[PDB]
Amino acid sequence: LSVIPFIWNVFKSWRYGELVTVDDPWGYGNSLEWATSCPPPRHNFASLPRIRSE
Amino acid sequence: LAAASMETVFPLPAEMVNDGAEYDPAKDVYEHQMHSVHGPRNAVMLIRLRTADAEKVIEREGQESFHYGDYYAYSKICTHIGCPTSLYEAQTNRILCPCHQSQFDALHYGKPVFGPAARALPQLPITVDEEGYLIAAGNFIEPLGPAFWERKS
Amino acid sequence: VGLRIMSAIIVGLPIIGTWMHWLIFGGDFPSDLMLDRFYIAHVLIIPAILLGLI
Amino acid sequence: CSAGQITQTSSQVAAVDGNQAGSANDPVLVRDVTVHLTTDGEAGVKFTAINQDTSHTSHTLESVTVDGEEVELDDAEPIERNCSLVADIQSELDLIEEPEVGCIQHVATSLENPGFAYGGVVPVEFVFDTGAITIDATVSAPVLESGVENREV
Amino acid sequence: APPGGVLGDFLRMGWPDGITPEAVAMGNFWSWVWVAAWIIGIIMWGLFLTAIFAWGAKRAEKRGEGEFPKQLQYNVPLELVLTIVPIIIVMVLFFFTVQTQDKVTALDKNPEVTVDVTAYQWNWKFGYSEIDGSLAPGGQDYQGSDPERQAAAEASKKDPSGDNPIHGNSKSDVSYLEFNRIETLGTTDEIPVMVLPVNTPIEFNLASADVAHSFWVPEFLFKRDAYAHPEANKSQRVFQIEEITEEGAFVGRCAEMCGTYHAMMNFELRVVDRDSFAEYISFRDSNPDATNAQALEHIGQAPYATSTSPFVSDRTATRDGENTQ
Amino acid sequence: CXXXXXXXXXXXXXXXXXXXX
Amino acid sequence: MGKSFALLVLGAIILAGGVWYTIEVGYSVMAIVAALIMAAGGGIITWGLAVAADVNSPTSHKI
Amino acid sequence: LLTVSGGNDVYAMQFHVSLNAMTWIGRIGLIVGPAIAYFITYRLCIGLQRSDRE
Amino acid sequence: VTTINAIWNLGPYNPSQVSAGSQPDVYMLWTDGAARVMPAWELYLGNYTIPAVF
Amino acid sequence: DQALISEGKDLYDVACITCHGVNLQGVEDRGPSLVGVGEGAVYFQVHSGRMPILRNEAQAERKAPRYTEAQTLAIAAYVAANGGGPGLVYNEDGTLAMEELRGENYDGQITSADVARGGDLFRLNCASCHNFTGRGGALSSGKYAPNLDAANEQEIYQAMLTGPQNMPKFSDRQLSADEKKDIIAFIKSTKETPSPGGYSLGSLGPVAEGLFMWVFGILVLVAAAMWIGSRS
Amino acid sequence: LGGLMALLIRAELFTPGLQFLSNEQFNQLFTMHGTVMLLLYGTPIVWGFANYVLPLQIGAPDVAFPRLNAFGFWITTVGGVAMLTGFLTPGGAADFGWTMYSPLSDAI
Amino acid sequence: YNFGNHKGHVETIWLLVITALLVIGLLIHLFEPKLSQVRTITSRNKPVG
Amino acid sequence: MLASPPLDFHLADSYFLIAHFHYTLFGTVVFASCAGVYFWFPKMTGRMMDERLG
Numbered sequence A: 001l002s003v004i005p006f007i008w009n010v011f012k013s014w015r016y017g018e019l020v021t022v023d024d025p026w027g028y029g030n031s032l033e034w035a036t037s038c039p040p041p042r043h044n045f046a047s048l049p050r051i052r053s054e
Numbered sequence B: 001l002a003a004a005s006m007e008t009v010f011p012l013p014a015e016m017v018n019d020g021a022e023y024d025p026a027k028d029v030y031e032h033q034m035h036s037v038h039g040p041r042n043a044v045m046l047i048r049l050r051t052a053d054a055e056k057v058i059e060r061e062g063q064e065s066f067h068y069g070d071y072y073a074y075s076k077i078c079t080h081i082g083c084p085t086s087l088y089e090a091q092t093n094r095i096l097c098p099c100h101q102s103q104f105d106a107l108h109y110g111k112p113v114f115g116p117a118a119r120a121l122p123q124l125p126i127t128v129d130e131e132g133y134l135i136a137a138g139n140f141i142e143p144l145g146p147a148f149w150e151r152k153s
Numbered sequence C: 001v002g003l004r005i006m007s008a009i010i011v012g013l014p015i016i017g018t019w020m021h022w023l024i025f026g027g028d029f030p031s032d033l034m035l036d037r038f039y040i041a042h043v044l045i046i047p048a049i050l051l052g053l054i
Numbered sequence D: 001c002s003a004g005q006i007t008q009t010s011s012q013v014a015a016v017d018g019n020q021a022g023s024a025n026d027p028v029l030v031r032d033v034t035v036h037l038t039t040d041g042e043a044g045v046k047f048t049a050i051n052q053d054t055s056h057t058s059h060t061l062e063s064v065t066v067d068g069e070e071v072e073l074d075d076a077e078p079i080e081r082n083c084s085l086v087a088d089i090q091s092e093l094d095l096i097e098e099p100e101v102g103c104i105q106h107v108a109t110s111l112e113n114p115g116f117a118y119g120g121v122v123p124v125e126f127v128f129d130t131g132a133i134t135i136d137a138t139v140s141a142p143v144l145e146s147g148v149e150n151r152e153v
Numbered sequence E: 001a002p003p004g005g006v007l008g009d010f011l012r013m014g015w016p017d018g019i020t021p022e023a024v025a026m027g028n029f030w031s032w033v034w035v036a037a038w039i040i041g042i043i044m045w046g047l048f049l050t051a052i053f054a055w056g057a058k059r060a061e062k063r064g065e066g067e068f069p070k071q072l073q074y075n076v077p078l079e080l081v082l083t084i085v086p087i088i089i090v091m092v093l094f095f096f097t098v099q100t101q102d103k104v105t106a107l108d109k110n111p112e113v114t115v116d117v118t119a120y121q122w123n124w125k126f127g128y129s130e131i132d133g134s135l136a137p138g139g140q141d142y143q144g145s146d147p148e149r150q151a152a153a154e155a156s157k158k159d160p161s162g163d164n165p166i167h168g169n170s171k172s173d174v175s176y177l178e179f180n181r182i183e184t185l186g187t188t189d190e191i192p193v194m195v196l197p198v199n200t201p202i203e204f205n206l207a208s209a210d211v212a213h214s215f216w217v218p219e220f221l222f223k224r225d226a227y228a229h230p231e232a233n234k235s236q237r238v239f240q241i242e243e244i245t246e247e248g249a250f251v252g253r254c255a256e257m258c259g260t261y262h263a264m265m266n267f268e269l270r271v272v273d274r275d276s277f278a279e280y281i282s283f284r285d286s287n288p289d290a291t292n293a294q295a296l297e298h299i300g301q302a303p304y305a306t307s308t309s310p311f312v313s314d315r316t317a318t319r320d321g322e323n324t325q
Numbered sequence F: 001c002x003x004x005x006x007x008x009x010x011x012x013x014x015x016x017x018x019x020x021x
Numbered sequence G: 001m002g003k004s005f006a007l008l009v010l011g012a013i014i015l016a017g018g019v020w021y022t023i024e025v026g027y028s029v030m031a032i033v034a035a036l037i038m039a040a041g042g043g044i045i046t047w048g049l050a051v052a053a054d055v056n057s058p059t060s061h062k063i
Numbered sequence H: 001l002l003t004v005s006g007g008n009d010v011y012a013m014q015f016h017v018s019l020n021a022m023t024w025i026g027r028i029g030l031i032v033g034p035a036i037a038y039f040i041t042y043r044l045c046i047g048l049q050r051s052d053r054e
Numbered sequence I: 001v002t003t004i005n006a007i008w009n010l011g012p013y014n015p016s017q018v019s020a021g022s023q024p025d026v027y028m029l030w031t032d033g034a035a036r037v038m039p040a041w042e043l044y045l046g047n048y049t050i051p052a053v054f
Numbered sequence J: 001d002q003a004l005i006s007e008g009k010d011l012y013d014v015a016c017i018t019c020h021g022v023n024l025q026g027v028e029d030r031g032p033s034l035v036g037v038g039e040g041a042v043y044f045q046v047h048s049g050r051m052p053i054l055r056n057e058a059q060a061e062r063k064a065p066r067y068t069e070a071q072t073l074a075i076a077a078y079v080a081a082n083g084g085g086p087g088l089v090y091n092e093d094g095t096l097a098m099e100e101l102r103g104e105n106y107d108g109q110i111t112s113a114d115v116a117r118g119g120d121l122f123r124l125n126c127a128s129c130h131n132f133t134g135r136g137g138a139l140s141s142g143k144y145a146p147n148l149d150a151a152n153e154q155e156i157y158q159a160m161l162t163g164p165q166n167m168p169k170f171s172d173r174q175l176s177a178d179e180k181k182d183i184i185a186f187i188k189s190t191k192e193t194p195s196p197g198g199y200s201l202g203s204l205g206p207v208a209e210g211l212f213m214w215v216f217g218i219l220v221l222v223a224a225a226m227w228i229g230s231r232s
Numbered sequence K: 001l002g003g004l005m006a007l008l009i010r011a012e013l014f015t016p017g018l019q020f021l022s023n024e025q026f027n028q029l030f031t032m033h034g035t036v037m038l039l040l041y042g043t044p045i046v047w048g049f050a051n052y053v054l055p056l057q058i059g060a061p062d063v064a065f066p067r068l069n070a071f072g073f074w075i076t077t078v079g080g081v082a083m084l085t086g087f088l089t090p091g092g093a094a095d096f097g098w099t100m101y102s103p104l105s106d107a108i
Numbered sequence L: 001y002n003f004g005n006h007k008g009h010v011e012t013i014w015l016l017v018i019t020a021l022l023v024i025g026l027l028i029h030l031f032e033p034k035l036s037q038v039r040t041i042t043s044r045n046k047p048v049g
Numbered sequence M: 001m002l003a004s005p006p007l008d009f010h011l012a013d014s015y016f017l018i019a020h021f022h023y024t025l026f027g028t029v030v031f032a033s034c035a036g037v038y039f040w041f042p043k044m045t046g047r048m049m050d051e052r053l054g
C-alpha cells in the first residue's frame, strides 16, 4: 500500500508541484550537479565553477 | 473397439458387403463402397467411452436410446461450416474441429462448449445385429452439417 | 476443405442461400460441373477482367 | 494458467478397460475391472484387489458375482497389507509371472457365459470377509498378441 | 552454557532446545553471538536516535548557534582504532566459529549404527546398513546390504547398448545408491519413520536418486544436502552424531528446492530405548514380510508419525485448511 | 438465441445383454 | 491534528472489524479478504500517525 | 490480427500458447490492438514533425 | 530453391478426412480468421435460422 | 524373468512411487493406476523420456530419457506383473522390432505399395490431430499432438496401442497389425524423404509459404527497388 | 510487477491448505518474483542513478558511448519482456527458484 | 463477448478487467480533470519571481 | 551469523535467510533508492515532491 502514496506523489508532482527557482533547492548541496539549473541544460552545463575540493 | 477410442464409420448397406463368412474373390463392390465414403454427410464418428465416463453422460430429450451400452455415434460434419470434427480428446472427452476451434462435449450429447459452432452434433442410433455386427438402428432426427435458412422446425 | 468451407458459407445465407449454392456448384457439393466452372473462371473469366482493368 | 488447481494431467485416468472403486480413505481397492469374454466363448473377470487399510486386518475375498452367478476363484490367501490380488482368466494369466519380491498373488477366474454383450455394462460385486464392493464393469475381449494379428477379409 | 533463564529463552529466537551434544554446542554459540550482536546493534541504534534528539536544526537555535558548525572531516586516529576494533571482533568470533564447527564435521565418533538415507522426488527411504554387534539381532555385527539387489545396481553402470557418455558410464548409473534388507519406504500417504536408539552414536549416509535434496532435522539444529553421485560432486555424504539424549518423535523436512512437491516430503525420527530398538531390529529382521507400522506396534510405539501427517493429494481440496490425512 | 430443440432430459440408467445363449 | 484523530479512529474501527472477521472464517479463502481488511485498517492508522508527525515538524509552508 | 488468428493453430503449436488463449487474443485484440496502434502512430507522426522543425 | 504446395503429401479430396490447421493461402487468411473470432451468435426465428457465419 | 522384476521394481521404488503409489493404485490428484496398462505402455512412457512427470500442466512433454533400454524393460516387467495389458512387439528372435515394422511387405526397404495404403489410413485417423505428414497440430487448451520425427517404430506402435494422454487407443482389433505397419511405413517414408523440389519450409503449408514471401520475399524486391530508384 | 507476485505468495501462506494456488504455480511465483527484483529492478535501478548523475558529477557534457548507452536500456527491456513471456505459456514460467540449482534445471 | 459457448470464466475476468480499464479511460477523456499548482516552499527554495 | 558454518547449518535455506536478505535488499535497493528519488527529483524535473505524501 506504500506504492499508492509514492505513485500519486510522482505522478502529481511531475506535472504540478512547486517550481524550483534556485540552482540548489536542498540548500547545502556539495557536489557539482548542484551548480546547474533544475533541470540542467541539454549539455549539462552553461558554465563550470572552480573545483578545488570534493 | 477399446474404451476411449474413436472410429470413422460409413453407411454400408447389406448388399454392398463382400467381407465376412461369405466372401467371393469375384464380386466387385469397390466402386459402390467408394460412394458411401465420398458422401457429403455420410461420415459418422463412433466413440467407445470408458464405463466410468458413460455414467456421466447427459442425453438430449428424444435421443436417450441412441447408444449401445458404451458406444455413441455422432455425425462427423461440423455444425458450423461442415469441416470434419475428428480431433477426439480421450481424457477431456471433447471433440475439436480443426477448421475453426469448436469443442463439442461428448458427455453432453455433443453440445458445443467453445468456438463459433452453436448447435450440438447430431447423434445416430445404433444397435447390434443377430450375427453380432454393429448396425444403424435408425436415421438421424435432424439435418446434418451446417445450418441453412429453412432448417430448424 | 477450402471449397467445403466456401460452399457451406454460401448455403447459410439468410434468404438466397440454398438457391445460390445450387446455381454456383450446379447442385450439392461436390458436383461434376464445379471444377469446370472453377477452371474456366480461373484461366479465362477473371484474367480477362484483370488484364482489362490493369 | 493450465498449471492451476484443476489441471489436465492430474485428473487423468488409467486409460484402460474397466473402472475402479475407492480412492484414499478406503481399506480395499479394486483396479481395472472388466468381464473378459474370449472370442470363442470363454468368460472370466479381471480385477486387482489392493489392501491398503492402515489398521492391518488382512481382508480376504469370499466371492465374486458378476450378474447372477458366482465366479470360480482359486483359494487365494487373504490380502495382508500393501499386497495385491491380480485375477484374470487362466489363458491370459500364463503371459505374466508371479513376483517373489513384493506380495502379489495371481488367481484365475471363470464364468458360465449366460449371455454378456460386448460393449455392455454389468454390476460386478465383490464380497470380502468384511464388506462388499459393487461396481459396473464393461464386457470386453482380452488384448490380442501385439503385432501378429492381420485381417481375414 | 546459556545465559540465565527467560533472557536465554529470548536470545534463542525459537532455536529448538536441541537433542544432540552438537546441537547443544551450536545453541550455546548462537546465544552468546546474539548477546554480542544485540549490544552492537543497541550502540548503533542509540547513535541513530541521538542524531534525532540531540543534533537538530532549530534545536541549535536557542543557543545562538548559526549554521555550518565544526565542519570536521578527518579524525585520523579514531578512524584507525575504529578499523581495528571490527578486525579484533571478527577474529575472536572466527576462532570460536572454527572451534565449534570442528565438533559437527568430525568423522571419528565410532558409530554403532549406520543409516542409508535416500532422497527421491518426492519422499525418503531409510535402510539400516551396519548395526554394532551389541544391539544386533543375534550378536554378530549386522550387515544390511542386499547381495543380489545391490549387485543389480552395480551392474547398471554400463548400458548394454552403446551408451557410456559420462566418463564411460551410463547416463542413468544408479550405483552410488545403497540397497538394504530392512528398508522404510515413504509413500505419499504414509510418512516414513526412522527408528533410532538413545545414547548411541548414529551415522547417516545421504544420497539422492535424481535431484538435490536436504536432510534437515530442526531438533538436530543441522542439515546436509544429499547429492546424486556425491563422490563426483566431491561432497561428503556422511555425517555423524555423538548420541541422541532425548526420547520421542521429531519432524524432518527437505530444506532444498526440488521440483513441485518440495513442501510435502517430510519424515519422522522415532528415538526409542536401546533394548527396545534392538528388539525392533530383531522383529523386522526375522519378519521380512512385515511392515514398519507392525514393527513399531511390536515395541509398543505409535504405528504412524505423530509430529507430522501426510498431505491430502487432492489439489482442489484443502481450501478449508484440512490438508492432513 | 438458444437452440430451440437442444434440450437435456431426465434419465438415470439402463441395462443390456446378448442373446443366442 | 484534525485529520489525524479522524484517520486514527476510522483505521482503528476498520482494523477491529477485520480482527473480528478473521475468527469466523476459519481457514477459507475469506481469510485472505479479512487480511486485506486489517491491512487497510493498519494502513489508515499509520496514515493518521504520519500526518500527525508531519504537522509537528513541517518542512513545507503554504506559500 | 485477422491473418494471424486465421492460422492460430499453427501459432499455438509452434510457439507453445493456449489455442483458447489465441482465440481470445484475436477477439479482444481486434478492439484493443487498433486503439493502441492509433495512439502510438499519431504520437510518433507528431514526433517526426517536431524533429523536422528543430 | 523452395517448396510450395507439396500436393503429393496431401491425398485426394475425401469429405470424411481432414488435417490439422488446414489454412488457405496467406491472402485468404483474413476471411478465415474472421470466422474463428466470431462468437456463436445464431438467430433462431420462427422455423428459420440465421447461422453464426452470417 | 525374476531378477528383471527384482531390479525392475527397485528402480520403480525410488522413482515411480510418489504420484503412483506402492501397489500402483494411483493417487487422488497425482497420477492414475498403473494396473492393466501393460508392458507396452511403460516402454512408451519411460523410453520416450515422457515419464516421470515433473510438474502438472496441460500436457506432459517428451524430454531426455531418465532410464536406459534395459532399465525401462525391467520397470515394464515389474508393472506387467500387476496385471498385464498390451505387450511389446517382437520379431523372429527375442528382440524389439524396429526397422521390421516399416511395412507389411518390408524386406530391406519400404514398398511403395505400403506407403500408398498407409497414407490413406494415416490421413483418415491421425492427419487431423497431427499434420498431413505428422508435423504436429494444436488441441483444446495448452495441449497439442507432437511432431512425429522423434519416435522410433516401436514407439509408434506402442503409442497407438495404448493411447498416451488425449490420443485415443487403437487396439489390434480396430487397426490390425498390417494396417499399423503400413501407417509406420508412411510415417517413416514422409520423414526420411527430402522434398522433390525446393527446401520444404517445415511442411507446415500455406502459412509458412506466406511468411517466407510476404515478409522476406517482398523485402528483397523492395531493397532492389530502393537501389534502382531515388530517396527523394 | 514483482510485488504483485510477492503478495500472491504471501496471501497463500496466510493459512494452512492451498486456497487458490497450486504447488506448480506457487513455485513459479517466487522464481519470477526473486528474479524480476534482482535483474529487472535492482540492477536496472543502479544504472539509472548512474546514467543520470555521474556525467553531472564529474563535469561531463555526455557519456563516452551515448549510442551504446541507449542500447543498454533497450536490451534490458527486451530481456525483461522475454523472461515474463513464460507466464503466457500453458505450463507457466520457470519454477526452480532464482538460482537454477542443478540437476533440477536441465532437459530431464 | 460474454454471450456465447464458453464454460470457463478465466476469460470473463479478462474481459471485465479490460472493459473496466477502458471505461475508466473514457470517463477520464470525458470529464477532463485538472489539478492545482502546489504553491509551497520546501527548505531553501525560492518563491516564483 | 550466517557467515559462521556452525550457525549456518540450521539457518541455511530457511526463513531466517529470507528475513536476512530482505533487511539488506529492501534496505539498500528500496530505502536508499527512494531516498535518491526524493533527493534528485528537483534536479531531474525542476519540480519538488510533496513532503506530506513523502
Ligand SMILES: CCCCCCCCCCCCCCCC(=O)O[C@H](COC(=O)CCCCCCC[C@@H](C)CCCCCCCCC)COP(=O)(O)O[C@H]1[C@H](O)[C@H](O)[C@@H](O)[C@@H](O)[C@@H]1O
Residues within 6 Å of the ligand: D001, D002, D003, D004, D006, D007, D008, H018, H019, H020, H021, H022, H024, H025, H028, H029, H032, H033, H036, J058, J140, J141, J142, K087, K088, L008, L010, L011, L012, L014
Ligand atoms: C505486437 C505485440 C503483440 C503483443 C501481444 C501480447 C498480448 C498477449 C496477452 C496474452 C495473455 C494470455 C494469458 C493466458 C490466459 C489463459 O490461458 O486463459 C485462457 C483465455 O485467455 C484469455 O482470456 C486472455 C485473452 C486476453 C488477451 C488480451 C490481448 C490484447 C493485447 C493485444 C493488448 C495488450 C498488450 C498490448 C501491447 C501493445 C504494445 C504497445 C504498448 C483460457 O485458458 P484455457 O486455454 O481454457 O486453459 C486452462 C485449462 O487448461 C485449465 O484446466 C484451467 O482450469 C482453466 O481455467 C483454463 O484456464
Ligand code: HEC
Residues within 6 Å of the ligand: D009, D010, D012, D013, D014, D015, D016, E121, J012, J015, J016, J017, J018, J019, J020, J030, J031, J032, J034, J037, J041, J042, J045, J046, J051, J052, J053, J054, J055, J059, J060, J075, J162, J163, J164, J165
Ligand atoms: C508427478 C509425478 C509422476 C512420476 C514421478 C511418474 N508418473 Fe507416471 N503419470 C503421471 C501422470 C500425471 C500421468 C497421467 C497421464 C500422462 O500425463 O501421461 C502418468 C501416466 C503414466 C502412464 C500412462 C498410463 C496410462 O495408460 O494412462 C504410465 C505407463 C506411467 N505413468 C508410468 C510411470 C513410470 C514407469 C514412472 C517411473 C518413474 C512414472 N510413471 C513416474 C505422473 C507421474
Ligand code: HEC
Residues within 6 Å of the ligand: B086, B087, B088, B089, J048, J050, J060, J062, J121, J122, J125, J126, J128, J129, J130, J139, J143, J144, J145, J146, J147, J148, J149, J150, J151, J155, J156, J157, J159, J160, J164, J165, J166, J167, J168, J183
Ligand atoms: C488428439 C487426437 C489424436 C489422434 C486421432 C492421434 N493422435 Fe497421436 N497423439 C496425440 C496426442 C495429444 C499425443 C501426445 C500424448 C503424449 O505424448 O502424452 C499423441 C502422441 C503420438 C505419438 C508419440 C509422439 C512422439 O513424438 O513420440 C505417436 C508416435 C503418435 N501420436 C502417432 C499417432 C498415430 C500413428 C495415429 C493414428 C493412426 C495417431 N497418433 C492419432 C493425439 C492424437
Ligand SMILES: CCCCCCCCCCCCCC(=O)O[C@H](COC(=O)CCCCCCCCCCC)COP(=O)(O)O
Residues within 6 Å of the ligand: E001, E024, E025, E026, E027, E028, E029, E032, E033, E035, E036, E039, E040, E089, E092, E093, E096, E100
Ligand atoms: C562490542 C562487543 C561487545 C562484546 C560482548 C561479549 C559478550 C560475549 C561473552 C562471551 C562469553 C564466552 C562464553 C563461551 O565460552 O561460549 C563459547 C564462545 O562464545 C562465543 O561465541 C562468544 C563470541 C562473542 C562475540 C565476540 C565479541 C568479543 C568482543 C571482544 C571483547 C571481549 C561458546 O560456547 P560452546 O563452545 O558452545 O560451549
Ligand SMILES: CCCCCCCCCCCCCC(=O)O[C@H](COC(=O)CCCCCCCCCCC)COP(=O)(O)O
Residues within 6 Å of the ligand: A001, A002, A004, A005, A007, A008, A011, A012, G040, G043, G044, G047, L028, L033, M053
Ligand atoms: C488522472 C488519473 C491518472 C492515474 C494515475 C495513477 C495513480 C493512481 C493512484 C491513486 C492514489 C490515490 C491518491 C491518494 O489518495 O493520495 C493522497 C492521500 O494519501 C493517501 O492516499 C495515503 C493513503 C495510502 C495508504 C492507505 C490505504 C488504505 C485504504 C485501503 C485501499 C484499498 C491524496 O491526497 P492529496 O490531495 O494528493 O494530498
Ligand SMILES: CCCCCCCCCCCCC
Residues within 6 Å of the ligand: H035, H036, H038, H039
Ligand atoms: C472506424 C475507425 C474510427 C476511428 C476512431 C479512432 C479512435 C481511436 C482513439 C484511441 C486513442 C485514444 C486517443
Ligand code: FES
Residues within 6 Å of the ligand: B078, B079, B080, B081, B082, B083, B085, B097, B098, B099, B100, B101, B102, B115, B116, B117
Ligand atoms: S467448421 Fe467446425 S468449427 Fe468452423
Ligand SMILES: [Ca+2]
Residues within 6 Å of the ligand: K011, K012, K013, K014, K015, K016, K017, K018, K019
Ligand atoms: Ca494457504
Ligand SMILES: [Cu+2]
Residues within 6 Å of the ligand: E119, E122, E212, E213, E214, E254, E255, E256, E257, E258, E262, E265
Ligand atoms: Cu526434496
Ligand SMILES: [Cu+2]
Residues within 6 Å of the ligand: E213, E214, E254, E255, E256, E257, E258, E262, E263, E265
Ligand atoms: Cu525438497
Ligand SMILES: [Mg+2]
Residues within 6 Å of the ligand: E255, E256, M012, M013
Ligand atoms: Mg540450499
